[PDB]
Structure 1
Amino acid sequence: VVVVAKFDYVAQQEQELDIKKNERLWLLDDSKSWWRVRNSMNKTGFVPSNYVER
């Protein structure tokens, strides 16, 4: 699935991707949602949203 950047996104962490408006992007996992989480040793990263519950 090719998608298109609607707007500029300036990465606010080294863990995010910078994209330019109109940029052609390849959407990689059947458009699955990821969430950003932090563990008890203060490490942060993305996990697929379906792997956690409140």
Structure 2
Amino acid sequence: KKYAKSKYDFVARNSSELSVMKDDVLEILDDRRQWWKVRNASGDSGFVPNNILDIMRTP
């Protein structure tokens, strides 16, 4: 059972994000695995775990 407290307010820019108020206590899920917000080829947007993604860059 991992917990954290929000130091600042956070307003979700859309329904896929979660709004929180300063001092709110939250339970951290998935064992702190980190996520990135991404958009696919068809314009769909959402969160994906970043440990299975590889950044693409010029050689």
Which TM-score applies when normalising by structure 1?
0.92
SS at match of 2:30: coil
Deviation for aligned residue 1:32: 1.1
Higher share in helix: 2
1:44 aligns to what?
A: 45
SS at match of 1:30: helix
State the distance in 1 between where 2:24 and 2:47 align.
Answer: 23
Which TM-score applies when normalising by structure 2?
0.85
Q: Which amino acid in structure 2 is aligned with residue 46 of structure 1? A: F
2:18 aligns to what?
A: 17
C-alpha root-mean-square deviation of aligned residues, in Å?
0.8
The number of residue pairs the alignment matches comes to 54
Deviations for 1:1-54, whole angstroms, at most 9, x for unmatched residues?
Answer: 011111100111211100000001000011111001111110011000101111
| Structure 2 spans left out of the alignment, 5+ residues | none
User: Which of the pair has more CA radius of gyration?
Assistant: 2
Following TM superposition, the consecutive aligned residue runs of length 4 or more in structure 1 with deviations greater than 6 angstroms are none
Identity score, percent: 39
